[PDB]
Structures are given as structure tokens and as C-alpha cells.
Amino acid sequence: APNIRKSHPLLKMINNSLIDLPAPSNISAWWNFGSLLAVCLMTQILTGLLLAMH
Amino acid sequence: APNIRKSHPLLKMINNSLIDLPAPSNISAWWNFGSLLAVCLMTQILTGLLLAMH
Amino acid sequence: YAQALQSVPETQVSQLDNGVRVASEQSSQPTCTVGVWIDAGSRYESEKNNGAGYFLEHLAFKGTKNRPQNALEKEVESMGAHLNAYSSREHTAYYIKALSKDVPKAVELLADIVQNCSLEDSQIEKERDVIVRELQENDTSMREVVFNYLHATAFQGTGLAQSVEGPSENIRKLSRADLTEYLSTHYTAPRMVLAAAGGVEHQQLLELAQKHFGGVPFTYDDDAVPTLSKCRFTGSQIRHREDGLPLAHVAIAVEGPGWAHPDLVALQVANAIIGHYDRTYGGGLHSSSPLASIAVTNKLCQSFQTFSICYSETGLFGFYFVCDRMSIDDMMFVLQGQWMRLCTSISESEVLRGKNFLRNALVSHLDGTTPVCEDIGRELLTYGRRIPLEEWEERLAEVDARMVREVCSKYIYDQCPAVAGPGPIEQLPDYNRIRSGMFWLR
Amino acid sequence: SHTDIKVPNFSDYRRPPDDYSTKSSRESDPSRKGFSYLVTAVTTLGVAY
Amino acid sequence: PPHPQDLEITKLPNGLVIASLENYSPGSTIGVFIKAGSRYENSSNLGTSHLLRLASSLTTKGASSFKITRGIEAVGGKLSVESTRENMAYTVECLRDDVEILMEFLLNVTTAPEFRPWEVADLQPQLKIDKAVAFQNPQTHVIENLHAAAYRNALADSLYCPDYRIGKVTSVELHDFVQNHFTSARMALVGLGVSHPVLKNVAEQLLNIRGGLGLSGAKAKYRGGEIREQNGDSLVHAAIVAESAAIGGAEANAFSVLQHVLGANPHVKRGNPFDVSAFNASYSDSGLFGFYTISQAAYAGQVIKAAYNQVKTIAQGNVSNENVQAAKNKLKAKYLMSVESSEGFLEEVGSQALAAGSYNPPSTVLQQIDAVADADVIKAAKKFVSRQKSMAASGNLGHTPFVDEL
Amino acid sequence: GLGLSGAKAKYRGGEIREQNGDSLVHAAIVAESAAIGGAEANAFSVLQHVLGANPHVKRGNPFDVSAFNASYSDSGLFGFYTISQAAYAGQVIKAAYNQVKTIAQGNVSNENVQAAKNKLKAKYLMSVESSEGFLEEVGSQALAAGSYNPPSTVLQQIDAVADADVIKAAKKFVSRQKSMAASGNLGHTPFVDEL
Amino acid sequence: SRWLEGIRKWYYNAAGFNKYGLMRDDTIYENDDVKEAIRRLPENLYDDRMFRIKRALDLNMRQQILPKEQWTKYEEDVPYLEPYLKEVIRERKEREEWDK
């Protein structure tokens, strides 16, 4: 395939979840928390790991 | 759908990786190691976790 | 209704000092149909004899010694009578349909055939190549090859496994003799039945037959009827693949009880429950027959049919669907699920209809003269006498839910089935799978 | 033509001694399934332990 | 007792002839015959008849598409519709008192059809296939084109909705088509295994359109057509006809007897493996005669000219007063035989109770076939040979002739 | 050398109608005639023009009508195609037809012929400006004949004849057997047996 | 004493789904019934509703409503789907019943 971003087994996973993903247009700001919750997690796991090391 | 095992977002993942999954017929016994390697991992993580607790 | 049945005239029966059984149903109809039904099929052939009975069928009409082709044909056509017939694995027959003003003439014609076929060494050689061709036509009818293959594997290694027409080799080489050898061995009064239905009165029939069927038995063999070697069923499959065809055919089945057995009624009632579909129906709302409904909702197949084909001491209780390369699986899944449901959690609301639908068939099973005659012919030959609608009624008018289950499960649950499938069948799962599709995770 | 096709012989070749024509396969197999399932029944059993 | 109870016919004030016949069968069948059909369509609205023939099961006012299908099924009933270019019969079988239960749906289906714009919009794609399977028989395709070349106006209309019109029939054209043809003056409530009074007590509810004549198919004008369908199937289906016949017209029985006087003649007259028969359709205000010939490709020519020559010389006096007796007696049979199976028989009691309003007994129906002979058969053929002909054909054809080559 | 060889084209009085309701009928009527290289040819070319304004200027409602003309090796065709509104197709065909008819019955002034004769001269000379269409000319002849008729004589030939032919060409049409073809609704359209 | 009619009108204007310009029926949650229902809806209406619904999402997307004038007035709200939606539901209850 052409795009080579929609054919690759892994990118296709990303380009279908953070790009090309159909989202309503009128999404409110309340929908910003799933995002935050996720990055909130990345953050904990990081700081935590780094903290567990001591 | 009928099967209700090939329609569900999660089962469909399993029924497509441990059932209904097309495998060659002449697969040799050497192919038994991916399996083992995986269960080998489940085992470590288990015993380990349980061991880390002390 | 019950009265309508109760007022249905009895079917006269009587054997000759010969051995032939002469039965009939007098009606009124200016027309009628009479014919003989033989206790002979392909089942009775050998590895080298197989096909005879069929080679034989294709000559039965082409003339007798008493009156050559040109004539026989001319004499029948001329009287507006119709002569037709067939042969299965355990049952052959020849019948004529005229104006009951000719029982005697018909009767004579009949006899003259089942007793003196010309077997013109010159005619034979012709039909030989006619069959070999006709056979290559029966072939592309994937709806029939499939059943043959079913029997083949279902009763592999036995007399039943052989197809009614027979191998091309046999047909290419059967001898003027073999045919005669097949005729004089199986066409005997004890195994034959002369049946009729129409304006015909029994006596005139008897006499007429008793007159043209002048057979005489000396020894005890002649007078006795030989029982066949049992046929071993075998849970197995056979896959004739070819993605070259437009769609696939599948047929799965368990061993059947056999005419004699009663349950063939309860079992006959169950099939009425799953019934049959066919893209020309109008019904995503079809009463039960979810198999049909489902078949419509999810587009599972082009059609399917439930069947309880049975024989003397065995049979086949299964189903057959025609489907697109891609919906083979779901179809099989869904269907095979119905058998389980059928014998594991059936309901009265279901069996109730089941029955009715049967009774309506049971009756239309006798719509006309030719068909009635077919029952008398058969009934006697396979059951022993005749079963009046009045009877079939009760038999299948007292089947409740628990009865269906008990039986179906008795014949279907955890049994090793026999499947067959020609066409683009890559999607049809392995045996093991359809196998474990024989037990419900109750 | 398909009429020209037979199923090879598994007789002896593979069939267990209770399987050779002219004898109902059915009288002998509830016994055949009984064995197999018993073996499996036992494994589930041993495994639980 | 003796199983005799004169089939009673009672023409209601509407014109709705009601006929019955209690033959005492364990199972009975009621049926609504009508003078509808594609014979009444225009350059537009086409196929509306066909689609109508498929809508059988769509929702009505007295019962829903669901209730009707499962309704009939719960009893072991059978709802079905047999249609011709100029007549539609809506039958339905069952048994005992389960007839009473059956009737409601039949009643509704024919007079209270409320074709819903969705239900039809969702049904029409059917045509595509119902038609597709039927056409798996070369025989049907050629006959469709036969009439095409046989006429110019009505009756020359297709029996299966033409392609171009599939998803275009409207929920309205269906009402309008019904409203104008499903009218008491052109209907009949026939039935078997039923008590005539009881069959009458129903006809009363079955009253929604006094309409009378309603529409009216334009008199079928004749034409000397010829359409060839090139497709190389390996074997040609060729049919040749000549204006003639007419149901109820005396000239009729003639052909029926020539239909048999002919056959062995054309058949017993040819070279190589084939098939040939005498064709014969007797319509309301017209009809057809001739013959269809399934023949091997290259040999088609030989096989057609032949079957033809026979029909020809047949007129030139090649009929012994013998051949006529044989024939005359074959119809007697085919008639009497094609009436054993109640449904085919019911088709007889109805067809007449709709056309005439009477019932010619087997006695006279024969008296009529017997009534004439020879001084006609020889002649019927003449009409053929002389009159203008119109042919139709399917298959390779390359070796097949055109009517201008006879 | 010669290789194969197309069988001489036998003529037939055919008529096939294509029912499809497109809202407007395409009807064409022809009669055996013409032949490339045959003298009788130029005649129609001139009738092809002698006709047109006639059929066109002779009708009712929005439509289109022209004189058809194909000149083949061992045969040819003449007549006319008529794109017309549905229901009006009948009127539009009979008309175009009547004109072709009466045209033969002497409705051609030695004037109309001059006009025409001079239109071909143009269309010829014009349909040769674009090299590819021109190349089509140099070739078609170098294949059929093996020569090259100069514009001088090609005209000398179109001029070579007239009137004592146009009136006549039409006759051949009217009298001879005809074969029609059509697409569209058609329901209001006639068959050749209705002329 | 207090008209449900008085109330209904209160609630209608209270809800506010009209400041976006959409009919009552333009808001019913699309469960199985409403889905069948809408599919039976004539094409006129379908596209009408389609646009309305999109025009509403866009307002909402902009955090802006429609000018007072354009607000659909209680008494002019057209129950375009309720008739359909109704048959769908009773058609179903009929089946939900028979199958028992």
C-alpha cells in the first residue's frame, strides 16, 4: 500500500488511535480527562520507578 | 453476529489467536518452544512476584 | 378431519399362490396408476454386478420378446398411458398411468416387462453409451454427487456405499448376460408388489395379475426372501475440493434406525422443526426454523434441507446446505447448534407445529393416483402392510417435547457424524471441530 | 464422474478391532467413547490434584 | 357415502363467483383467482405485477407480515401465488378446521394489502434473483422473447420484471395496480374440501372493491417478430409460432388435437440427439401455435427445417383419421390425469368459474373434444403454414436460420 | 496475400426495440444501399445533405433528426436517426420519414442540389485540415483502391452527377425493405410495419 | 388546576434543545427501536433531520446557539418520527409475545 502508515502492523495501530481516528467535532473540554488520566499514569509509573530505585 | 465468539471485541482476539487460527499441519515439535517460552514467562513473573514479597 | 380420515377407504391386499402381493386403493377417478415395485436396488449388486439394475432400467421399456420396441412404445402411446419408473439402493419400480379402463391391459404390459425384456444385444450396446453420457450429466449436479459421496463414506466398505448408477467401467463392460443374470435373480414374485389406485376394483386386478403373473415356485428358496448383509456406519468425512465452483455443498449425518423402527416418527417430527430454507421464501420471520431465520438474518446459505432417508435396517438422519465460499462456517455452526438445541432443550410450542407441518405433508404425500400407488408399493415392501393416514396420525399425533429430545439425543448427541463436501470448502473447519459440535456445553 | 470414486480402506489399517463391516458400529462404540473419555476424565482428574 | 356433492357455484351480487366442492379430503385448499397480470401494464409501471406477486407476504391491515407468515405456519398452512400473463391465483392449503384459521390471512392478502414504502423498498431487490433462478431454464427466456416478437402491445409484456425497472416500482403503482384489477367482477372465491355455505360466509367480508371491470387490457395486436439471443450455450432453443387459438373459441380444441396429432411426427423425423415438440398457448383474446426445438448447435438448422416441414406437409393432408382418434383420446387422458392432484384440479374448477362462470362436466368436455376432428386438424395446420410467423431463439445460433429462410 | 475473407453481407429486414425508459427515444431507420467505390454512392452523400433541413425543418417540440449514411465495402446503409422526446417520438419519426418519402416524389429543386453538392465539397475539404483526419483519407484509399483521387477530381466526381439521382436515391429508400432500431421508453414509438 | 399543557410548554422551553434549532425527535437517544424507526423515515425528512442534527453539532462545537428568531416554537415542533417509532415498538411487542 501507498501510505505505508496505514499498512504497517504497528503504525496502523497508532494511525488508527491518535490520527485518522474519527472524533466528533463538538467534543467538550470534559473529554480532556481520559488523555490526562493516561499521561497521569505514565508520569506516576515514571517518577515511581525512579523513586523505587532508592 | 451468530457465533458471539467472533463478534465480541475481546473474545475475537482470543478466538483468533488460540482457536480458528490457521496453523500449518506439518508443524514440527520444534515449534513447541514459543508456547513454552510464554508459559515460562508467566511462571517466572508469578514465582518471582510471590518471592519478591519476602 | 378425523372423520375424513376415518372415512378414507381401506387398502385391499392379497398374495397369490405365487408370492406376489397385490394391493390397491379404489377411488372413483376415471384415471389410475398401477405398477410393480421390486425389492431390488444397487445395494443388491456386487463389485462387478453394480450398475446392472440401472443398465436394466434403461432397457425395461425398449421392448419385449412378445412385442419388440416399435410396438410396445406404439401400443402405450396409442392408449394415452404413461410408463415411467426408477431404482434406488433398496427399491426399484415400474408404473403405468391410464384410465382404469385398462387395468387388464396395463397389468399385462407390466408383467411382460418385468419378465421378458428383449435385451437386444444390439439395443444394449446403445444404451451403454447413453448412460455413460447420462452419467456425465448426473455428475455436474453437485447436489447429487454430494449425497453419493455422503453414502460412500457414511457406509464405506459396504453394499450401500456403491452408487445406484455404478462405475463407468462396469457400464462400459456389463454383458448381455449379466443383465439377464440380474433380472432372473431379483425380479421374483415374493419380492415384488403389484399396486394400484383409481377406479379399479381389487378383484378385476387380482385375477388380471393372477392371470398374467403365471409364476410357479418349486423349491423353498424361490418361495423365500434373502436378508442382506448389515451395513456398517462410520463417523467419517470426504472432501472433494475445488475452489473452481460458484459455491459449496455440505452434508452431515448420523446413522438412522430403519423403516421398521417407530421412532422414525418422532425423528421425522424433529426434522419438521428445523425444516428447510431457500432464497425464494419471503420470511425473515419464518416460524421457528431459526436455522432458516438465522440463514436469512446473517445470509448463511442458498438453501438447506433436513432429511431422514432410511433403509431396511439402517439409514441417514442429517442435513445439507448449499452456501457461498465465505459463509460455510457460520452456517454449519448455527445448524449443528440446532440439532443440539433440538435434542437438549426443545419446547411444546415447537413440537406442536412440527406435528401439524408433518400431518400436512403426510397427507399431501398422497395427492393423486401415481403417488398413492407409491405408498402401497413401498409400505408393503418395506413395512409389511399399509399404514393408513388414520394411523400415521396417531403415531405422530402423540409426540410431545420430551419425546423429541429423548430420541433426537438418542440418535444425535455425541455421535460421530459423517460429513461430505464438494466445491470451495477451504473454510469448513476440520472433523474434530464439527465433531465436538455434537455435544452442547450444557 | 464421481460415481467412479471409492473411500480407501482404513480397515485394520487404522480401525480399532470392533470395526469391520456386517457388524453394527454402534453397539461397539459407546464402549469406544467410554474408553477415550475415561482417559481424558482421568487427566482432568490427575491435573486437578 | 358415495363421495358426491355437486360443486355449487353462486355468483354474488358483486360478480364475485363463488365455487366449491366437498370431496371429503383430509386436507383442503381455498383460492382466489383474478383476471390480473402483466397483460395490463404500460411502457411504465411494468413489472408491478411481478413485484405484486412477491409482496404476497408483506403487511396488511388485518395481520402483520410477521403474524401472517408465522400465523399460517403454526397451522401447517401454505400460502403461495401462481401468476400468468393474464391471471393471478392466490392459493393456500391446510386441513380440518385449520382452514377457518387460514382464511383470515388469505382474506387480508388479497383485499387489504397496505404496501408500506419501506417493506417494498426493502423487497424489490428480490426480483433480481427470483428472476435470476427462473432464467436458469433456457425454456423460460425464449418464451419471454417469443411473446415479445409475437405481439406489439399488451400480452407482449414480460412475465418477469424487466431489468431496468427493478428498484423503480413504487408503493403506489402497487395499490393502483391492485385497485384497478382486484375487483369482485373479475375475482372468484374457489375452494375444495369445504362446505359451500361456509365458503360463502367468507366472500361477504371479502368485499372492499365493487369496482366491476376496473381497467382493461388493450386488444393484443399481432406482429411478425424475430429476436435472436447470441450466447453460445452449445445448444439452441428455437421456437416458432403463428397467431391463432383463443380460450373459449371453437377453433381451440382443433389445435389441442393437432398438438397431439403432431409430435411423434416432428420427433420421428430428424437427425442426431435432440428434442422437438408442438407449442400451444390459448389466451383470452388471442393465442399461439408452433413448436419449440432444443437441438444441438450445428444441427439446429436441420432440426428446425424438419420439425417445420412436418407441420407443413401435415396440413397438405398427411393425417389419417386414425392419428386423429389416437390424439383425441390422448387429450382425454392428459385432461383427466392432470386433475388428479387437487391443486392442478383446483386450477381447473377456478379457471372456468372465472372465465365463463359455469362448469363443463367431464362428459361434455369430452363431448366437445370428440365433437370435432379431422375436417379440422388438416386445416389447423394450413392456417399455420400460410399465416405470418414469428420466431425466437437462444444459444450459439450461427448455424440456425431466420424466418425469412423459413 | 488475401488470407481469410468476410462472407458477402446478406441483407435482412430487422427490427429490435430496447425497452429501458430513458425519457427520450433514439430511433434509426435504414434501407439496404450504398457501397464505397460504387457510383450510386455520391448520390446519397448529396441526398444526405439534400436531406436534413428538410426533416429537421418539419416537426413539433424540442428534438433532433438527421440523415443516416454508412457506405461499406460490399454494402451500405441509408436512412436517419432521431433523438426525440418520448411521447412525441411517434410524431417525430413519421415526420422525418414522410420528408424522406415525398423527397423521392420529386420534392427537390435543382437548387437544393447545388447547395448540397457544395456542402460536401466543404465538409470534405474541412474534415482534412487536422492531419490525423486527413491521414485517415490518404490511407483509406491507398488501402481500398491503391490510388489517390485529387481534390480536383474528387469534386469533379461529386459534381459529375446530381438531381437526376437525388430524387431517385430517395425512391430506392421508400420502396426497398427497411430495418429499424431503437432505444428508450418506446411505448409511444411505432414499428416498421406501421411505417 | 395546572395544565399539563402549561407544564409541557414550560419544560419544552426549559430543556432548550430548540435554541440549537432541532425538533424534540431530533434528540431521542438512538436505541434499537429509534434505529429501525429512522430507517423507515421518508427521505424528505431524513435529510432534513440530518442537516438539523449537524447544524446543532456545529453550534455546539462553537459554543454558540441560534438567534432567538430561529428557535423552533413549542407549537410548531413536528413529531416526525413518533408515528413510526410507535409501530416499531408495537410490531416488536407483538413478536416478543408470539415467541412465548
Ligand code: HEM
Ligand atoms: C498508579 C500510579 C501510582 C500511584 C497512584 C501511586 C501512589 C503513591 C502514593 C500514594 C505514595 C505515597 C507518597 C507519600 O509518601 O506521601 C506512593 C509512594 C511510593 N510509590 Fe507510588 N504510586 C504509583 C505508582 C508507583 C510505581 C509503579 C512505583 C514504582 C515502581 C511507585 C513506587 C512508590 C514508592 C517507592 C513509594 C515510596 C516513596 C515515597 O512514598 O515517597 N509508585 N505512591
Ligand code: HEM
Ligand atoms: C523474566 C523472568 C525472570 C527471570 C529471567 C528471573 C531470574 C532471576 C534470577 C536469575 C534470580 C536469582 C536466583 C538465585 O538467587 O539463584 C532471580 C531472583 C529474584 N527474582 Fe527473578 N527473575 C524473573 C522475574 C522476576 C520477577 C518479575 C520478580 C518479581 C516481581 C522476580 C523477583 C526476584 C527476586 C525477589 C529475586 C530474589 C530472590 C532469590 O533470588 O531467591 N523475578 N530472578
